[PDB]
């Protein structure tokens with residue numbers, strides 16, 4: 020593996036048909052027999068593992084212990100036909116035959132897979148790199164054919180990305196992808212967050228800003244993966260372990276709890292449909308359920324209790340699941356503003372931003388960099404902006420003692436923590452806790468869950484308050500959420516046009532009050548008349564209430580003006596009212612809402628179309644790649660996969676800096692400098708090397 | 714064929730065969746396919762309309778019961794919101810169909826202590842249900858066709 | 860796919876479609892790594908026929 | 909149509925330089941290329 024790493028290092032910064040790569044191919048050709056022997060070793064052992072996994076082999080073996088005779092083992096593989104006779108003999112030699120000549124295929128298979136994984140992966144990487152950099156050579160293709168099974172086995176782990184290389188030339192980078200990393204990426208909530216992020220950037224992000232947003236999303240996804248790993252599960256102490264198990268179970272089942280709460284609200288409301296009111300008990304009216312069985316009243320009581328309990332459990336699960344992500348994002352953005360921009364040092368917003376003002380409390384606190392990974396951001400901020408405000412000013416701003424960092428740098432001291440409730444009591448930092456509670460209470464999802472719980476308690480007070488929980492299914496479904504968001508998408512225009520409608524109706528009311536008072540009587544009886552325009556407020560309310568709702572306008576409601584001296588002015592008044600208010604303004608308000616709905620749906624479709632048409636990383640359209648069949652599909656799947664970019668970032672984080680290669684170190688330095696020039700921008704490996712490839 | 718045999722049983726069952734000309738013509742086939750082109754959205758928005766009408770029914774049942782009498786005769790009254798199921802059916806049946814909303818059907822609240830809340834209730838019903846949600850369902854069908 | 864399982868055993872499966880030798884081609888393709896007899900019983904062929 | 913005219917005017921300003929008429933895409937090859945071109949190289953405020 021070390022030798023192959025040296026060869027790969029020789030291949031760093033190599034162009035297509037490079038002289039280094041050609042010498043490597045010639046050297047492989049000179050040692051072709053030994054290379055084939057190595058590849059045969061790897062492929063035979065991989066095939067042996069798949070065969071001990073194979074049903075035909077399991078049928079061949081008849082021992083209850085699973086031990087197979089050398090003769091039976093031989094006939095089993097020759098039944099599989101993947102191995103030739105000398106290969107079978109060599110496998111028999113490799114297997115440690117006991118005195119009965121019995122063979123344990125499980126240990127015979129897993130004995131060599133673990134040691135050979137690293138070297139096999141490196142060999143696959145080297146062969147892939149050589150094949151892509153020297154595409155025309157037939158000897159390389161032969162070597163690839165022999166290593167076909169190894170390449171197939173390591174394909175899901177082999178990650179490739181292209182970076183904007185150091186030499187101002189596009190380079191392709193090969194790296195390992197962990198099985199755990201891929202498994203966490205395949206998680207449905209991670210996929211949902213990825214979809215949300217993609218929609219947000221493609222809708223309202225510029226290309227230059229989009230790399231920074233993408234890197235921030237990668238960091239948030241890494242933290243979310245850590246949260247998921249922690250919450251996943253394979254006398255103060257026993258109480259504590261039970262409590263953490265309970266919290267983890269709540270966090271894992273948070274969406275299930277939400278759905279159960281929705282179902283409980285539906286059942287409660289269905290029960291409520293049977294409610295009826297009668298003056299007689301089951302001059303004050305009595306509310307009681309009307310059912311023959313009589314089970315429904317206790318059923319409703321238990322259902323309400325269980326619904327409130329489930330709402331409380333949902334709040335706890337949300338605190339254990341999403342609040343860490345919220346705090347992580349806020350701490351990360353605060354740290355970056357503190358260090359790269361010197362926000363509270365240089366900028367010093369004088370109540371410019373409410374979030375910025377709130378963030379002032381946490382800077383002094385010792386526990387500020389807790390949730391976010393960098394615990395040295397305070398020290399970095401000090402080293403950056405100390406000189407031109409002074410060490411002591413930055414120290415008092417960030418709540419550091421200056422001698423503490425020096426003594427920690429000089430040596431490490433470990434204090435023992437007492438396992439006491441009080442010892443945990445002054446362990447708390449009230450300023451950080453207050454800032455965290457403010458951040459949580461400013462969160463829309465937490466506020467929604469709190470309103471849900473409050474409405475559940477109010478439902479315990481009066482059962483009909485449980486009807487408000489039926490609104491949750493609206494925000495649960497994307498179409499209904501878009502419907503709700505449509506009314507606020509054009510909210511300013513809606514408010515202004517409603518105001519204009521009110522103004523025009525007020526003018527019509529003024530005209531009616533001055534002249535057309537007689538027609539506004541709404542009482543048929545001569546003895547008792549009721550007048551709408553005898554009072555200006557009454558007539559204004561009458562107009563806004565009945566005229567706007569009426570299809571023909573106010574003239575439908577008020578009395579016919581036939582045979583009156585004001586008849587022509589009155590018909591003009593009615594017709595103009597019906598034209599301006601019923602037709603134009605109501606149509607405009609309806610149009611605002613409906614066009615908001617349609618515009619949001621078109622935004623969804625446009626985001627999907629843009630993803631299908633352009634590569635998200637390099638920005639080149641699908642048409643250029645599509646000249647080669649499935650060209651865009653391959654480009655997005657292997658060459659420029661954003662999942663591969665995230666995997667590369669995680670791999671860089673886990674890997675040791677001393678172990679970083681040249682390209683890895685270069686990308687790591689750009690990443691810590693927050694410079695995104697390494698991302699390919701309008702350029703591709705196949706675009707840069709198109710002539711040499713062709 | 715089954716409908717033809719049922720038409721032999723009763724002649725009016727032959728009326729169902731008139732639907733065949735619809736699927737025969739491309740324009741009518743597109744009209745039929747439009748209602749299913751956005752079927753999931755249609756079902757969800759109809760459910761949301763039912764939910765909002767149910768909330769309005771709950772409010773009316775709790776407070777505005779008196780206005781819901783639909784009998785002019787003093788001796789024999791009939792009540793829609795005396796029972797929650799009855800008032801829900803009354804809403805979904807008459808309020809949605811009415812152009813002005815439920816307030817057109819129910820009795821005028823003039824000179825009542827609940828008059829302002831009731832006019833707010835009627836106006837919001839007419840805005841949310843008659844205008845927005847019905848317009849959205851119509852839009853789903855028509856935009857599917859187009 | 861579940862419904863199509865019944866027709867594989869039947870002798871008349873390739874009737875309507877033109878290739879009457881698709882069973883034999885499937886056997887020659889995937890016999891070795893399941894065995895001749897397994898593909899034969901799957902497609903309802905006698906091997907000697 | 910009037911509202912679409914407003915949006916189209918805004919979009920045209922975002923897409924093309926007001927002085928030279930070259931689209932944003934040519935400048936955008938260099939990062940923030942159009943922003944720099946409109947801010948220093950071809951600022952109509954600078955022309956005034």
Ligand SMILES: Nc1ncnc2c1ncn2[C@@H]1O[C@H](COP(=O)(O)OP(=O)(O)OP(=O)(O)O)[C@@H](O)[C@H]1O
Nearest residue numbers: 630631632633634635636637655656659660661662
């Ligand atoms: N750089 C990129 N990396 C990955 N995917 C990209 C990139 N640029 C564009 N895409 C598009 O992103 C899409 C995401 O694929 P995915 O399968 O996860 O999506 P989906 O919403 O499940 O639908 P579908 O399977 O129809 O694409 C791909 O279809 C691809 O065309």
Ligand SMILES: Nc1ncnc2c1ncn2[C@@H]1O[C@H](COP(=O)(O)OP(=O)(O)OP(=O)(O)O)[C@@H](O)[C@H]1O
Nearest residue numbers: 921922923924925926927928946947950951952953
């Ligand atoms: N030659 C040009 N000179 C200046 N601005 C130009 C030119 N060509 C196009 N523009 C565009 O004019 C816009 C005017 O910028 P300004 O900040 O004044 O506008 P705004 O209406 O406040 O909105 P915004 O800040 O979102 O651009 C710029 O965003 C720029 O893209």
Ligand SMILES: O=C(O)c1cnc2[nH]c(=O)[nH]c(=O)c2c1
Nearest residue numbers: 237238241242245392393672691
């Ligand atoms: O929390 C972690 O595992 C973690 C540790 N260190 C990190 N370093 C870095 O530069 N970026 C990260 O995203 C990161 C994450």
Ligand SMILES: [Ca+2]
Nearest residue numbers: 676677678679
């Ligand atoms: Ca090194």
Ligand SMILES: [Zn+2]
Nearest residue numbers: 634637638659
């Ligand atoms: Zn690309």
Ligand SMILES: [Zn+2]
Nearest residue numbers: 925928929950
């Ligand atoms: Zn210009």
